[PDB]
Amino acid sequence: EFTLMVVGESGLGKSTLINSLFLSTVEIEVKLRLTVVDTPFKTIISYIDEQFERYLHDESGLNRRHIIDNRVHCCFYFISPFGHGLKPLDVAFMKAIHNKVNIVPVIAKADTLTLKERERLKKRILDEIEEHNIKIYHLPFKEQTRLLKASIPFSVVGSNQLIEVRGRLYPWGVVEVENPEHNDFLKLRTMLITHMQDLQEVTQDLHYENFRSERLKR
Amino acid sequence: FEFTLMVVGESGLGKSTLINSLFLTKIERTVQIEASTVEIEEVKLRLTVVDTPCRDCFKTIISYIDEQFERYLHDESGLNRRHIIDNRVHCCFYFISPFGHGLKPLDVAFMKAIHNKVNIVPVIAKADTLTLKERERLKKRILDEIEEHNIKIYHLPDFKEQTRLLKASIPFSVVGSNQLIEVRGRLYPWGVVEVENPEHNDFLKLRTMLITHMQDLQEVTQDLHYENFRSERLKR
Numbered sequence: 001e002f003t004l005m006v007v008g009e010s011g012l013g014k015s016t017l018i019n020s021l022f023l024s025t026v027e028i029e030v031k032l033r034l035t036v037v038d039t040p041f042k043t044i045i046s047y048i049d050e051q052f053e054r055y056l057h058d059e060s061g062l063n064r065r066h067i068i069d070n071r072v073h074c075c076f077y078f079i080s081p082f083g084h085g086l087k088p089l090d091v092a093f094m095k096a097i098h099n100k101v102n103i104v105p106v107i108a109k110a111d112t113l114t115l116k117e118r119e120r121l122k123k124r125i126l127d128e129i130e131e132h133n134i135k136i137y138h139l140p141f142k143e144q145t146r147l148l149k150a151s152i153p154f155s156v157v158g159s160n161q162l163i164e165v166r167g168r169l170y171p172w173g174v175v176e177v178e179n180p181e182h183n184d185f186l187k188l189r190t191m192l193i194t195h196m197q198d199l200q201e202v203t204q205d206l207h208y209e210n211f212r213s214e215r216l217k218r
Numbered sequence: 219f220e221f222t223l224m225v226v227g228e229s230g231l232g233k234s235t236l237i238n239s240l241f242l243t244k245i246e247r248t249v250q251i252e253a254s255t256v257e258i259e260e261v262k263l264r265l266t267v268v269d270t271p272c273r274d275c276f277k278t279i280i281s282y283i284d285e286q287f288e289r290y291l292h293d294e295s296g297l298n299r300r301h302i303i304d305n306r307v308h309c310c311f312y313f314i315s316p317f318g319h320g321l322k323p324l325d326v327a328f329m330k331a332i333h334n335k336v337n338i339v340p341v342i343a344k345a346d347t348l349t350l351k352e353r354e355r356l357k358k359r360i361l362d363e364i365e366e367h368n369i370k371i372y373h374l375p376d377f378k379e380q381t382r383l384l385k386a387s388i389p390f391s392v393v394g395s396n397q398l399i400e401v402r403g404r405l406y407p408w409g410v411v412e413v414e415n416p417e418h419n420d421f422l423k424l425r426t427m428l429i430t431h432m433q434d435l436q437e438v439t440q441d442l443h444y445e446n447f448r449s450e451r452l453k454r
């Protein structure tokens with residue numbers, strides 16, 4: 001029972017990555033719900049909040065032994081590799097929903113950046129995360145958990161096309177989706193796969209209860 | 219000899235980097251587009267780069283195009299005409315993002331706004347984000363959209379094969395780099411994009427076409443766009 005939202009500018013490979021992970025709400029079979037949404041927000045917030053209402057209403061009921069959890073457990077936020085950081089629309093969106101959903105920031109179409117360019121954009125996005133007091137999902141073995149945090153935000157490449165593993169062909173070379181020397185796709189997936197319970201659990205224990213307390217107080 | 223080259227398009231599309239490669243070096247008022255204009259001698263060249271998005275920015279560019287027409291009309295209407303300084307925009311690279319499936323309707327209306335006043339040369343920026351197959355689909359979608367909407371881009375005139383193959387590339391999909399490599403280029407873990415490598419991208423054609431068509435761009439600007447502006451202007 002798990003729900004993942006992907007949000008971001010149109011044309012940033014949002015759909016291709018989702019397809020790459022698993023090989024406007026689609027529901028494939030754990031039971032995964034995916035909600036892809038292209039940025040141009042008062043409906044996005046409201047969708048998220050509406051899933052807390054159903055759940056609060058449902059858990060408040062006399063019949064429970066068929067409750068559907070539609071709460072969004074994670075939101076990949078896609079950032080253009082063309083900016084030098086977060087655009088203020090991106091910051092405003094993330095601030096609108098950071099108290100309600102687990103944000104995982106992702107740099108899109110990372111095959112657009114040299115390694116030097118990549119690390120400048122990551123450093124700059126992390127600093128802006130701090131500067132604007134934005135609350136992104138924080139990961140909870142030794143060195144593999146070390147290396148994964150030290151590469152947030154993940155800069156990914158999607159493709160489901162094959163190359164004489166999946167990749168993208170340019171006259172000067174081939175980007176390999178699952179080569180970590182090429183991009184953080186494997187890390188993002190592994191992280192998604194290894195952290196589902198926590199994602200679910202932080203959604204329950206933190207975002208939903210905060211929703212719930214303000215409600216029963218008001 | 220005087221040439222003014224303008225480049226417009228969203229920021230983050232490599233526009234300065236491209237310009238740098240050709241030679242190796244809130245917008246709301248005509249004034250600040252002038253302040254953006256750099257002058258180099260390489261022939262007196264002026265480069266005028268304008269980040270587009272807020273659609274007032276498009277109105278200022280238009281107003282700016284005309285002001286250069288105005289300067290000229292005013293200067294040739296006066297009594298001392300020895301050096302009329304020609305600041306009329308002879309060319310507009312229009313950078314389109316490789317992330318769209320074509321032109322947005324803003325681009326379309328804007329190009330319709332400026333297409334009887336400057337020579338639009340459309341350019342797909344950051345072409346190293348596109349596989350060759352993607353490159354073709356975007357080129358065709360962009361040309362279709364120009365037909366569909368009757369956008370008048372600059373028609374290259376007409377050793378033999380060099381004109382055909384150059385036309386075939388329009389709109390040119392280009393790559394710029396300030397960095398050098400072993401060539402100006404872009405180093406990725408998987409390979410190196412070479413700017414001047416025509417297999418890799420159409421930069422070589424853009425520069426060659428500019429270098430080669432500069433006189434005709436100037437002339438079309440004079441004989442067509444300018445005289446069109448001047449006829450309309452005097453009527454009022």
Ligand SMILES: Nc1nc2c(ncn2[C@@H]2O[C@H](COP(=O)(O)OP(=O)(O)O)[C@@H](O)[C@H]2O)c(=O)[nH]1
Nearest residue numbers: 010011012013014015016109111156157158347
């Ligand atoms: N350079 C690059 N291009 C990509 C990548 N992923 C997808 N694309 C291209 O971008 C197009 C749009 O991707 P899409 O998933 O539809 O983006 P979306 O609008 O955010 O869902 C795809 O058809 C691919 O041709 C990537 O990782 N790198």
Ligand SMILES: Nc1nc2c(ncn2[C@@H]2O[C@H](COP(=O)(O)OP(=O)(O)O)[C@@H](O)[C@H]2O)c(=O)[nH]1
Nearest residue numbers: 112228229230231232233234235344392393394
């Ligand atoms: N992938 C790619 N990146 C580029 C290209 N040209 C420039 N860049 C990168 O994009 C950054 C910003 O480009 P810039 O020229 O300042 O874009 P402008 O805002 O349109 O003037 C540069 O520092 C380069 O890192 C290109 O052809 N391809």
